[PDB]
UniProtKB/Swiss-Prot annotation, chain C:
GO biological process entries: bacterial-type flagellum assembly; protein secretion
Protein's organism: Salmonella typhimurium (strain LT2 / SGSC1412 / ATCC 700720)
PANTHER family given in the database record: FLAGELLAR BIOSYNTHETIC PROTEIN FLIQ (PTHR34040:SF2)
Domain of life: Bacteria
Keywords in alphabetical order: Bacterial flagellum, Cell inner membrane, Cell membrane, Membrane, Transmembrane, Transmembrane helix
Family of this protein: Belongs to the FliQ/MopD/SpaQ family.
NCBIfam families in alphabetical order: fliQ (TIGR01402)
Protein name: Flagellar biosynthetic protein FliQ
Keyword field contains Acetylation: no
Predominant subcellular localization, coarse grouping: membrane
UniProtKB/Swiss-Prot annotation, chain D:
GO biological process: bacterial-type flagellum assembly; bacterial-type flagellum-dependent cell motility
Keyword Cell cycle attributed: no
Name of the protein described by the UniProt record: Flagellar hook-basal body complex protein FliE
Family of this protein: Belongs to the FliE family.
Keyword Acyltransferase: no
GO CC annotation, single: bacterial-type flagellum basal body
Compartments reported by the entry: Bacterial flagellum basal body
Assigned keywords, A-Z: Bacterial flagellum
InterPro entries, per database record: FliE
Gene Ontology MF term list: cytoskeletal motor activity; structural molecule activity
From Swiss-Prot, chain E:
One GO term of the biological process aspect: protein secretion
Name of the protein described by the UniProt record: Flagellar biosynthetic protein FliP
Key word Iron present: no
Transferase is among the record's keywords: no
Classification via PROSITE patterns: FLIP_1 (PS01060), FLIP_2 (PS01061)
NCBIfam families: fliP, PRK12797.1
From Swiss-Prot, chain F:
Subunit-level organization: The basal body constitutes a major portion of the flagellar organelle and consists of four rings (L,P,S, and M) mounted on a central rod. The M ring is integral to the inner membrane of the cell and may be connected to the flagellar rod via the S ring. The S (supramembrane ring) lies just distal to the M ring. The L and P rings lie in the outer membrane and the periplasmic space, respectively.
Listed name of the protein: Flagellar M-ring protein
Organism from which the protein derives: Salmonella typhimurium (strain LT2 / SGSC1412 / ATCC 700720)
Gene name for this UniProt entry: fliF
Described purpose of this protein according to its UniProt entry: The M ring may be actively involved in energy transduction.
Induction text: Inhibited in nutrient-poor medium.
Localisation per UniProt entry: Cell inner membrane; Bacterial flagellum basal body
Coiled coil residues, start to end: none
Assigned protein family: Belongs to the FliF family.
Top-level taxon of the source organism: Bacteria
């Protein structure tokens, strides 16, 4: 659904509800573009936005998990893996590529 | 050697300090009693330390009526700036109090005017919202900058003064009302219609209405109406601040 | 920090106030309207008998929904005080 | 610093385009008084050492002058502190 | 270096300005204003007998300024006490960690304004800002932050009064004062939601964030 | 078992409820994707997200337990165990992989 | 029970009630999965989730008791016992495995 | 909500213009705009990911990649071009 | 909202006038109007991206490139021309 | 009508009248005026000068005289408080910069 | 609003001035644009107002030097503190008459 779910014209219980809706919509659109690519039949994106401490100025960063289903035998290129990484990282404010995991329908890790 | 001429430094550091401190004691947020007095005095002292060396030092003795005239001039300038700034918060408070009074929140004023029983809670709500907005738009920095800038326009040295100019600040008393209505015109109007609607209900079977059904309905309607109207004040907040600021710039000169 | 954030927190605050006050006000309004229509039907008119059941109804309203209001307002205040150091400017 | 020298050349360019303080004065006065006191002390130690050419007259007069300068500094500090206390009592 | 008499004189004189350092260069200011505003909010202008709030603010400031004081001691006071750094250089060495704390919390707009008011040249990096610019910029930023915190603090205690007045007005009790009813409920709220632990933690984070 | 599943529950929901519902939804979607992996017939994800405590000198981190049911004889590859780990860890803010346990329908620990 | 238990929620729900209900639901789902493992016919999970404090002298970590009923003669493998431990420990924020007790239908302690 | 909506509108219009470009059949723009800070240090630069689908065999020229970069960077306050990624329908980074 | 709407209306009028230029069949203007930072060394500035679709073979003159630049720069308070990018329907940078 | 709305409307009206007078000029068939009025900020000294862009469509072959370009410049500059002529750009229907 | 009132006043003055300028023999139609100065939230500075006057003449009715002068005087007087030198007079062909 993505932004469509936001366009259902439904009361946002609270900022937290708004944030959850935003996270879901971003996930949806990202999966959409990933599928659009030739070798990809369906995509599933999970985003983990992080949380701050209490008195610790030490900080962390968000993470993403991407599962792709490929067309029969349509193996993804190294460059392909690279482009998926770039897109997902850019779509998430301050997402360090190295925190993007890409996996296939058989459970092979396509990234590092 | 070992001169350290004290009168020169005193006359250089005194009058700018007087003007800065006069603004501090009246300018909104900088004049709130919650700040300790020593913090305000230190802020004035440090601002004067930064500003004064660039200005031409005056030589009028502190033991003369000219010094009294200078001190009166600095106090007048500071209080005028601070009060002209305060007018906007006065207008916001007026609009909030009127919305609250049309809520029926304090009905005892219509029967006992000034009877030690009044709670303009909406006025306080929008007053503190206006203070938060003023903090966000960095109005206080502007105030300090304009306090500095009024020197070039009006130097420390005694200068002649004008008249209708004072009226202008006094005539700014109209804005508090005028702009106040501009903040209350939509919501009150619908509330008016609601009251009109209640009148239609009272044109039916006599009594058995108003003071029993009107008050809760109008209270809830006012609450949700002006809760929806909250996003509207911010453009009006900037409009009020711009009005006060350019009126100050035009009239101080 | 942005004025959008300021107006959003103000609006959410006053919607919380509306949610807190709506049950009591609505119960009082319904009781008053019911007593008024009964008076109109019976052709009885004294301005004081409508004030009697309103107090009882509104006081029962705290019995039934009071814990919900107390839990909602505390949660609002707790979240506001916890998010205070992240909306600083 | 490399960036510090960058800033120095930037300020030189600023001077090209364009074409001390009360704390500084107090620091200068303190340095002068301390230097006078140290000079008197060093001359006194040199005289106590037995080195030729140093006269007791000069030692004693310089110690006298150093004491007077110290007392002047003490008085200036006392007043300055009194004036600061007076200002911090001002109502705002 | 200065004579020992001059060093003692300077030390004694500098001991005078301790309240000024606490008020204008330390966390104490925005550790108080919040307390005064909160006391104004709950409707008890005396309640915690001041002195109590001042002691709590002093302890909070001591707990918050601990790393800055530690850095000053390790970098300036320790070499000075061991006769490795002169008295006129220990001050300059120790004024730098305090200056850095004063920056980590001082907003920009204020820095730009006070860089313009001094007619100083362009400041390309934060390393060119002198103390004469950072001091009042830090003071103004602290005042604004304290007032923001207090004004978002004020909202629930006025919300409660609003709903109390509306409920009283629904039933026609127009001559009942709402403040007297609201004060016990405001106290109940401030008891329930850990009134002080949450505020203490929020202020401490507000410094370390 | 569904993001929209808990996207209702009327109102009067103490935020506690809002969080628990999020946790459930995340669990559901993760199990879903894990099932999509070919060899996996059904997945079950349990998250333990600790509610922050100002008692310990530093914050503790969450944990996950993943149970998979495989298709008749469809043993999971080492690289597969690795990819499941990565996905679950990423989906949970600050989830250290080493706190993800993966188990099969027979009770063999794959992690 | 479990997730379904938290459906018909009356407005009158004290935080205490909220928590107790969460505990019940977690217990239910854990027992459910434990039954999914082949050798297990029915499972019963009891959680003791308590107060934390700070004095290191008196710290009581969360604890769990798991009772399993096995299929006629279906003895649990050491590895199985290990996997039950892992699952239960992970499902409880800060549950130290060593505080998970696993027992069979005859009263034999399968853990330690 | 007001911000998120602004972000999704900007994304839409940018994709729109990109598809206008002859060789481009459809475009998808994702913006990552970070939290602003008014202190004296905290600051981070935004990022963009652009996926283009080309017409059968319509390869984008170097200059074309350059113009896409310029447009996307300009449309986002303070977007450093180097933070714009352009990718095709096959997963080739045109950047 | 009031600001964002101002932006949309301006973008629209600018595109309009640009199309009303003989060789131009349609124009698309994107404005990036942000907030600046003082004493951040090299800050940045408002920026514009202009995409033009030309009439079959109607190449824009160097003067035409210059006049488009001037108009767009003037229409945006404090827009430094050098921050205006002009691109054609094929992705050639005209500026 | 918001304070901002009031300003934007004033800007639009000024643009309209200026275009009107420019068109009335013999050689000019239609005119389009765009004004960029700037913003005062507490982080700058001299506020940036307003700017204007003027597009004219000429009658078939009616080239504008150097004086015609000048007079257009003067009118547009005067109509905008503090508009420095040098910030007025005049362009034809073919994209030739006349200023 | 006051701002609306000010805009209306500016428009009315422009209209009447154009009117009188047309009534003049050689002038067929006139168009007057006034730029009244503005206030600032900081810094003192007057911006002597400015005027632009476009006249359309009757076929061949060239304006006299005296005529330019009189137009200048009228427009300057009608605007509080308008320095003549800030009045521009232009014809229908774009010739600057002032």
């Amino acid at each position: 659904v993505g932004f469509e779910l936001l366009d259902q014209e439904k009361f946002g219980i609270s900022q937290f509800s708004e944030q959850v809706n935003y996270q879901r919509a971003l996930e949806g659109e990202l999966a959409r573009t990933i599928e659009t690519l030739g070798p990809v039949k369906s995509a599933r994106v999970h985003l983990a936005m992080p949380k701050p401490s209490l008195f610790v100025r030490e900080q962390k960063s968000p993470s993403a998990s991407v599962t792709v289903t490929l067309e029969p035998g349509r193996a993804l290129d190294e460059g392909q893996i690279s482009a998926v990484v770039h897109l997902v990282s850019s779509a998430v404010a301050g997402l360090p590529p190295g925190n993007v995991t890409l996996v296939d329908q058989s459970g092979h890790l396509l990234t590092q | 050697v070992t001169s350290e001429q004290w009168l020169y430094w005193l006359h250089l550091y005194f009058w700018p300090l007087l003007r800065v401190l006069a603004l501090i004691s009246t300018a909104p947020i900088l004049s709130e009693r919650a700040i300790p007095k020593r913090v305000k005095l230190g802020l004035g002292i440090m601002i004067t330390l930064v500003i004064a060396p660039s200005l031409p030092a005056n030589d009028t003795p502190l033991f003369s009526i000219a010094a009294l005239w200078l001190a009166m001039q600095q106090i007048l300038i500071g209080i005028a700036l601070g009060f002209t700034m305060q007018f906007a918060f006065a207008a916001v408070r007026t609009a909030g109090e009127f919305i609250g009074l049309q809520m029926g929140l304090s009905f005892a004023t219509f029967v006992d005017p000034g009877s030690h029983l009044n709670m303009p809670v909406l006025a306080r709500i929008m007053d503190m919202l206006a203070m938060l907005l003023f903090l966000t738009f960095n109005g206080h920095l502007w105030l300090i900058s304009l306090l500095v800038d009024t020197f070039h326009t009006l130097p420390i040295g005694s200068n002649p003064v004008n008249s209708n100019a004072f009226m202008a600040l006094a005539r700014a008393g109209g804005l508090i009302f005028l702009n106040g209505l501009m903040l209350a015109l939509p919501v009150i109007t619908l509330l008016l219609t609601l009251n009109l609607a209640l009148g239609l209900l009272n044109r039916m079977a006599p009594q058995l209405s108003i003071f029993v059904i009107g008050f809760p309905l109008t209270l809830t309607v006012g609450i949700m109406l002006m809760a929806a109207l909250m996003p509207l004040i911010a453009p009006f907040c900037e409009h009020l601040f711009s009005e006060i600021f350019n009126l100050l710039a035009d009239i101080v000169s | 920090m942005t004025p959008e954030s300021v107006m959003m927190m103000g609006t959410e605050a006053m919607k919380v106030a509306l949610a807190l006050a709506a049950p009591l006000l609505l119960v009082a309004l319904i009781t008053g309207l019911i007593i008024s229509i009964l008076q109109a039907a019976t052709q009885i008119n004294e301005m004081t008998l409508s004030f009697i059941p309103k107090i009882v109804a509104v006081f029962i309203a705290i019995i039934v929904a009071g814990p919900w209001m107390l839990n909602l307002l505390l949660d609002y205040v707790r979240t506001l005080f916890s998010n205070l150091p992240y909306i600083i400017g | 610093a490399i960036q510090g020298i960058e800033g120095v050349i930037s300020q030189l360019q600023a001077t090209a385009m364009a074409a001390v303080s009360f704390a500084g004065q107090l620091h200068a006065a303190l340095d002068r008084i301390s230097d006078r006191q140290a000079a008197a002390r060093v001359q006194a130690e040199k005289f106590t050492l037995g080195e030729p050419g140093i006269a007791l007259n000069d030692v004693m007069a310089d110690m006298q002058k150093a004491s007077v300068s110290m007392q002047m500094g003490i008085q200036v500090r006392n007043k300055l502190v009194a004036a600061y206390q007076e200002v911090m009592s001002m109502q705002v | 270096s200065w004579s020992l008499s001059v060093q003692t004189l300077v030390f004694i004189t500098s001991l005078t300005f301790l309240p000024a350092i606490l008020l204008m260069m330390t966390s104490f200011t925005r550790i108080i204003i919040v307390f005064g505003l909160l006391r104004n909010a709950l409707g008890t202008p005396s309640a915690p007998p001041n002195q109590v709030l001042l002691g709590l603010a002093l302890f909070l400031t001591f707990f918050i300024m601990s790393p800055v004081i530690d850095k000053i001691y390790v970098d300036a006071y320790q070499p000075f006490s061991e006769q490795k750094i002169s008295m006129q250089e220990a001050l300059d060495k120790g004024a730098q960690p305090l200056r850095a704390f004063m920056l980590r919390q001082t907003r920009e707009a204020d820095l730009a304004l006070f860089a313009r008011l001094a007619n100083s040249g362009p400041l390309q990096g934060p390393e060119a800002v002198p103390m004469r610019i950072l001091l009042p910029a830090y003071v103004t930023s602290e005042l604004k932050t304290a007032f923001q915190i207090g004004f978002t603090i004020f909202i629930p205690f006025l919300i409660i009064d609003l709903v109390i007045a509306s409920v009283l007005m629904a039933l026609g009790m127009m001559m009942v004062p709402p403040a007297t009813i609201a004060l016990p409920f405001k106290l109940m709220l401030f008891v329930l939601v850990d009134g002080w632990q949450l505020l203490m933690g929020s202020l401490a984070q507000s410094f370390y964030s």
